Amino acid sequence: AQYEDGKQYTTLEKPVAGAPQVLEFFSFFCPHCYQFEEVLHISDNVKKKLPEGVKMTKYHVNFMGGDLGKDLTQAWAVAMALGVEDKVTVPLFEGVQKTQTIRSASDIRDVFINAGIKGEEYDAAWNSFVVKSLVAQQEKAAADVQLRGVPAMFVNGKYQLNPQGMDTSNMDVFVQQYADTVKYLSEK
């Protein structure tokens, strides 16, 4: 009643097994995504509503931005492999959509160095298999769920969260509603 399949979430017709707990696809080029992270703080709020044990996962997509899009996906892999995701996210959104300093593969690297990673660590990580695998892993995940647009978040690999069927009025009300539905979906 409170959460029906079709209002606040749509049950995937052809569910994907082996998928992570809570998956969230995004792109540094996607403007709505900036609103999701920087303004709404969706990623850190949903995390503060998820039950103990469950873990969130973010993947970058390459159908937006051209070759540099693919580089940002690979750049995102490096962010995951090194586990510095909780620091490079903002300056990458700002460097691409706001300041507009990031316009090639070199500027992205420059962001990481200023962030706190050695210039040798980044480059060595960029050409690492763990990174290539993650780029192939992300691409596959995005292809399985037949992703068409970002942002987007899936649960249990069998439930796609619909932001359409939720409160749009109070920005704070949509946040909690978006997080609550994730809590329920996680338990089910």
UniProtKB/Swiss-Prot annotation:
Residues 1-131 form the Thioredoxin domain. It is found in: Periplasm. SUPFAM superfamilies: Thioredoxin-like. GO terms for biological process: cellular response to antibiotic. It comes from the Bacteria. Keywords: Disulfide bond, Periplasm, Redox-active center, Signal. Disulfide bonds join C30-C33. One of its GO terms (cellular component) is outer membrane-bounded periplasmic space. One of its GO terms (molecular function) is protein-disulfide reductase activity. It holds the Pfam family DSBA. Disruption phenotype: Induction of the PhoP/PhoQ two-component regulatory system, suppressed by 50 uM CuSO(4). Its main location: periplasm. Belongs to the thioredoxin family. DsbA subfamily. Required for disulfide bond formation in some periplasmic proteins such as PhoA or OmpA. Acts by transferring its disulfide bond to other proteins and is reduced in the process. DsbA is reoxidized by DsbB. Required for pilus biogenesis. PhoP-regulated transcription is redox-sensitive, being activated when the periplasm becomes more reducing (deletion of dsbA/dsbB, treatment with dithiothreitol). MgrB acts between DsbA/DsbB and PhoP/PhoQ in this pathway. This is Thiol:disulfide interchange protein DsbA. It comes from Escherichia coli (strain K12). The lineage of its organism: Bacteria, Pseudomonadati, Pseudomonadota, Gammaproteobacteria, Enterobacterales.
